[PDB]
From Swiss-Prot, chains A, B:
<feature type="glycosylation site" description="N-linked (GlcNAc...) asparagine; by host">
    <location>
        <position position="153"/>
    </location>
</feature>
<feature type="disulfide bond">
    <location>
        <begin position="183"/>
        <end position="283"/>
    </location>
</feature>
<feature type="disulfide bond">
    <location>
        <begin position="300"/>
        <end position="331"/>
    </location>
</feature>
<feature type="disulfide bond">
    <location>
        <begin position="60"/>
        <end position="121"/>
    </location>
</feature>
<feature type="glycosylation site" description="N-linked (GlcNAc...) asparagine; by host">
    <location>
        <position position="67"/>
    </location>
</feature>
<protein>
    <recommendedName>
        <fullName>Envelope protein E</fullName>
    </recommendedName>
</protein>
<feature type="disulfide bond">
    <location>
        <begin position="74"/>
        <end position="105"/>
    </location>
</feature>
<feature type="disulfide bond">
    <location>
        <begin position="92"/>
        <end position="116"/>
    </location>
</feature>
<feature type="topological domain" description="Extracellular">
    <location>
        <begin position="1"/>
        <end position="392"/>
    </location>
</feature>
<feature type="disulfide bond">
    <location>
        <begin position="3"/>
        <end position="30"/>
    </location>
</feature>
<comment type="function">
    <text>Binds to host cell surface receptor and mediates fusion between viral and cellular membranes. Envelope protein is synthesized in the endoplasmic reticulum in the form of heterodimer with protein prM. They play a role in virion budding in the ER, and the newly formed immature particle is covered with 60 spikes composed of heterodimer between precursor prM and envelope protein E. The virion is transported to the Golgi apparatus where the low pH causes dissociation of PrM-E heterodimers and formation of E homodimers. prM-E cleavage is inefficient, and many virions are only partially matured.</text>
</comment>
<comment type="subunit">
    <text>Homodimer; in the endoplasmic reticulum and Golgi. Interacts with protein prM. Interacts with non-structural protein 1.</text>
</comment>
<feature type="region of interest" description="Fusion peptide">
    <location>
        <begin position="98"/>
        <end position="111"/>
    </location>
</feature>
Length: 392, 392
């Protein structure tokens, strides 16, 4: 009964005739399902974690200059040269500074000079490439047991992983059997014109082209260190208007500027490996092998006293909690729906075939009452439990 | 002789008649001045440091969240509340989450919820406000002694501070007297429509209006800690689409984005407190009480041997270094300019009244030879020194 108490909750009907029941599992969503002589299921879609990815490019957003070296020749004696002009960890720019007797050159004129700066990237962006057959949605299916605490507990689920190519698999629900599902991963983002850009614990999804266009020093992705940052000119600058000495200057973090830019793009909020993509996944459940929780049970012959005051959910159902003051042991719970007097049936039951498993464990049931006045009859003849109800 | 070797160098002539000489001292500049029977000065404008400033406001560019606290009531039981909502250190937002039996509220419906977060600023900007009558320009005046090392040494000068309201002040040059200057600081930036915005070791100067408009958490300037950051929401964001829990999230450093935004703005090189401003300061020096280095000397009667090969400066002068193999002691240096034969004077002498102070200290002299062929005659009769020269 996980879905119990979830805002976005879909109730799917069994279609009296056949078994299969197609669904639509979506993030922030949940779906209760029910069928004729079939348990009521609460199928949810937990995550849309992409398995392994391939990192394409790798942008730098925080540069730190180190080991500044320089060399300078006099007038009429060619440019200077540092071996650092050939290293790639180093960015260098030549320039011309006044030179005379004063500063060591017996000749007067514009001398030559070159400066270099070892570049080390602190923080950086990784632009990843994900595609269709790379995703593994995890479905959690909690059967309506009626268990004492089962009411809206996102824990009790029966886990099932459904990949793009293992498209149809089956879950084994304790004492219910096996639920086969036939899902088909459709996605409203073409993972062919989109890059999964990471950055610290976060992650977006943008255009290949755009991502590539960003003004940022990069290094075609690869693990275990020491890059050769390309285009370090977009973060490292050189100034020298007075022609005296040349100042080196990094640009400071682009984290902020990137967030600001990543406005309209959809977020993904990375979890430290896995990710939550919005993916409206459509299946079709096979009720076949899925058996029920014993029709071979007798009807309970005693009383049910309402342990927790009944409540209405955000959709138009009730949740009854009752304790059996019997001794019947395993037995069905007599559910008789009254239209105010006792002539017909207007409201139906959600928790299919509610049972008392142990005299000592309270039983939760969820029903869908009629409109306006309605009376319930949980039990039999002798002091049978009555709950009058007003709907709408 | 500091100026000697400076690219942008200005030769200001005496205007034969009176004493005063107006000049124009500028960053990146240097001016050699000269007059009749007056020493040749080398006025330069060192720094344009603004004395004491007041911080108007103070924006924050990097936020760090801490001690996250929250409180949430059931449905139909009003919003939740925290004592932190009243704290200025905490930024808080209310929102609504699904509530049911499961998560502790016997009633079903949308619950109330408030979350808070102790905001703390790591790095922050300072917007100061300077106004003309605040700053002290520092002029360095080196006289052309002709001293052994003085050739372009930016050390030997005679310091002078000229403030906006200390408009005219005088400097004592050793063995030359006193030079008076009547400066009038003019600047091409209205320090009334601009704020000097610092940021780490850097600093620019932008429009008050713009500065304030910046999307940043501020705290009207004040020293010795513990701010009450105003409008913290411009860095802190809150998420809650699924209505389960509320996520706290900062925006990361704006350093980059700021630099990025500070493009057109003119820079100032804030160096440990004091700063450099582009200021074309215009003076007028009084040559009056500025005497010269003894006309009371006799002419040197021996030989001078060129100690360092003479060289042409970036403008069109020459720098003569010579040793006096004499014994005359303190004496003038007979400077005769030849037009190629000995009929007239085409070239002058920049280094005024060149003198040898000690037989054992070389003397440097700067002269301005005629165009084309020219011959120099330093000394008298006996093997006197000659330097053939070709100009243009
Ligand atoms: C820019 O200016 C600086 C300062 O110039 C000062 O010079 C004074 C003479 C005086 O006019 C001041 O008013 C003026 O401001 C220059 O500096 C000077 O550097 C020189 C060169 O290094 C220092 O000269 C001394 O040289 C001594 C001998 O070294 C030999 O010289 C022989 C020449 O006969 C030569 O044949 C040899 O081959 C060898 O090179 C050396 O022994 C001195 O050491 C000093 O020892 C005394 C103790 O007696 C100490 O008190 C002193 O501090 C030294 O340790 C010197 O090295 C001179 O000291 C420096 N002067 C000062 C105080 O700064 C600078 O060079 C110049 N820049 C340029 C244009 O190159
Ligand atoms: C949400 O559900 C969990 C787990 O609910 C479990 O209940 C038992 C009765 C089984 O039906 C099981 O399949 C189901 O998953 C609730 O947490 C706690 O569960 C404990 C049972 O494991 C329970 O009792 C104690 O005794 C058992 C052994 O018999 C022991 O394993 C436990 O550690 C525990 O000591 C305990 O009462 C229950 N928690 C509390 C304090 O009530 C959880 O309570 C549910 N949340 C809600 C809606 O309150
Ligand atoms: C904020 O917490 C400060 C540190 O207390 C920590 O104690 C740990 C045991 C754990 O509970 C953490 O969550 C706490 O942060 C504490 O010293 C301050 O008093 C707290 N309040 C302020 C000033 O923010
Ligand atoms: C650069 O300087 C560091 C110390 O700052 C030194 O360890 C290193 O040898 C120098 N050369 C390199 C590798 O850049």
């Amino acid at each position: 009964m996980r879905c119990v108490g979830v805002g976005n909750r879909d109730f799917v009907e069994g279609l009296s005739g056949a078994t299969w029941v197609d669904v639509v599992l979506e993030h922030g969503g949940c779906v209760t399902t029910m069928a004729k002589n079939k348990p009521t299921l609460d199928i949810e879609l937990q995550k849309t974690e992409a398995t392994q990815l391939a990192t394409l490019r790798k942008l730098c957003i925080e540069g730190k200059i180190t080991n500044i070296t320089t060399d300078s020749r006099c007038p009429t004696q060619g440019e200077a040269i540092l071996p650092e002009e050939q290293d790639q960890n180093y960015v260098c720019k030549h320039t011309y500074v006044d030179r005379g007797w004063g500063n060591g050159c017996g000749l007067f004129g514009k001398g030559s000079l070159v400066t270099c700066a070892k570049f080390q990237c602190l923080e950086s962006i990784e632009g990843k490439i994900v595609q269709h057959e790379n995703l593994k949605y995890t479905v959690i299916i909690t059967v309506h047991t009626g268990d004492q605490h089962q009411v809206g507990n996102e824990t009790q689920g029966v886990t099932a992983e459904i990949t793009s190519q293992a498209s149809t698999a089956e879950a084994i629900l304790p004492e219910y059997g096996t639920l086969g599902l036939e899902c088909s991963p459709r996605t409203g983002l073409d993972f062919n014109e989109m890059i999964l850009l990471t950055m610290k614990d976060k992650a977006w999804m943008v255009h290949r082209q755009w991502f590539f266009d960003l003004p940022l020093p990069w290094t075609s992705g690869a693990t275990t260190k020491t890059p050769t940052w390309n285009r370090k000119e977009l973060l490292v600058t050189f100034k020298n208007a007075h022609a005296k000495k040349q100042e080196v200057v990094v640009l400071g973090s682009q984290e902020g500027a990137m967030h600001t830019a990543l406005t309209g793009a959809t977020e993904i909020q990375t979890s430290g490996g896995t990710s939550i993509f919005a993916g409206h996944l459509k299946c079709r459940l096979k009720m076949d092998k899925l058996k029920l929780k014993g029709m071979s049970y007798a009807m309970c012959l005693n009383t049910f006293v309402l342990k927790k005051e009944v409540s209405e959910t955000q959709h138009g159902t009730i949740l009854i909690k009752v304790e059996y003051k019997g001794e019947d042991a395993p037995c069905k719970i007599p559910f008789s729906t009254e239209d105010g007097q006792g002539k017909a049936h207007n409201g139906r039951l959600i928790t299919a075939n509610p049972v008392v498993t142990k005299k000592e464990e309270p039983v939760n049931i969820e029903a869908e009452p009629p409109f306006g006045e309605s009376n319930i009859v949980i039990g039999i003849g002798d002091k049978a439990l009555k709950i009058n109800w007003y709907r709408k």
